[PDB]
Amino acid sequence: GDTKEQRILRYVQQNAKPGDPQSVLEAIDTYCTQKEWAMNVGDAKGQIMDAVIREYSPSLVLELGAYCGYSAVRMARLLQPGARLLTMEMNPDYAAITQQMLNFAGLQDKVTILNGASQDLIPQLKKKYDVDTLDMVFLDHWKDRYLPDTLLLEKCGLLRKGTVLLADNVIVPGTPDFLAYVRGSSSFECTHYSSYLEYMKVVDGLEKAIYQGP
Numbered sequence: 095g096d097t098k099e100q101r102i103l104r105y106v107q108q109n110a111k112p113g114d115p116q117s118v119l120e121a122i123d124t125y126c127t128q129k130e131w132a133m134n135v136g137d138a139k140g141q142i143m144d145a146v147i148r149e150y151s152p153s154l155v156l157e158l159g160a161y162c163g164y165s166a167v168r169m170a171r172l173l174q175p176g177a178r179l180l181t182m183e184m185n186p187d188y189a190a191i192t193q194q195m196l197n198f199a200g201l202q203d204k205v206t207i208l209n210g211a212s213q214d215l216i217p218q219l220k221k222k223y224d225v226d227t228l229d230m231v232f233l234d235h236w237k238d239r240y241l242p243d244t245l246l247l248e249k250c251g252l253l254r255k256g257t258v259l260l261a262d263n264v265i266v267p268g269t270p271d272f273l274a275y276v277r278g279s280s281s282f283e284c285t286h287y288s289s290y291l292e293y294m295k296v297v298d299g300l301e302k303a304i305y306q307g308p
């Protein structure tokens with residue numbers, strides 16, 4: 095039968111207003127609080143995300159790991175006209191959910207899905223997707239990939255002075271190599287935002303790591 099992700103999308107379609115991103119976020123968070131937990135960033139950490147996005151007003155954001163599109167809706171709804179989000183989702187079923195979520199929210203013109211693995215797509219961003227450098231990166235994919243993909247972004251010339259990395263789940267499930275690396279590197283200026291795991295009374299946090307150049 096249907097999957098949890100399909101159930102979340104249907105719930106949104108039936109309990110939110112087309113073209114109203116805030117209603118979409120609220121519907122997802124209600125479903126995941128009342129019916130079934132799911133690994134969306136959630137409202138606690140989402141509020142911290144919102145504060146960061148508002149501070150930096152990025153023109154080009156890369157997201158690693160879309161899932162159902164919750165974080166993509168969260169960020170894209172606060173981007174300025176003409177600003178863009180690219181989100182990389184390796185699971186094709188999740189990619190289809192995310193596209194449909196974005197379509198429902200009316201944010202499809204601001205967001206592009208890149209279906210594939212981050213390590214394969216990151217090296218294509220300049221030539222295939224006409225990216226120069228990224229203003230912000232939201233990391234929310236497999237936790238073991240945060241570090242290697244950060245290093246790949248740098249190798250590929252995608253980071254500039256001031257690029258904001260914002261990493262979910264640095265406590266649960268945790269990203270110990272990434273966290274050690276950024277906090278020990280003179281190429282990053284790091285801030286920890288303590289919060290809670292989505293929909294749970296469990297401590298989690300976001301790490302912001304601002305790239306300083308080589």
Ligand SMILES: Nc1ncnc2c1ncn2CCCCCNC(=O)c1cc(-c2ccc(F)cc2)cc(O)c1O
Nearest residue numbers: 133134135159161234235236237262263266267291292
């Ligand atoms: N061993 C592998 N090999 C390849 N892929 C793999 C994998 N293992 C996973 N994945 C595919 C990653 C795609 C989703 C990435 N996100 C997450 O995994 C994630 C998980 C939690 C979570 C927290 C507490 C819990 F008790 C359980 C899960 C919360 C979040 O906010 C998340 O973003």
Ligand SMILES: [Cl-]
Nearest residue numbers: 134135164165
């Ligand atoms: Cl999410």
Ligand SMILES: [Cl-]
Nearest residue numbers: 159182183184
């Ligand atoms: Cl992905």
Ligand SMILES: [Cl-]
Nearest residue numbers: 136137138293
């Ligand atoms: Cl929450």
Ligand SMILES: [Mg+2]
Nearest residue numbers: 135234262263
């Ligand atoms: Mg997460």
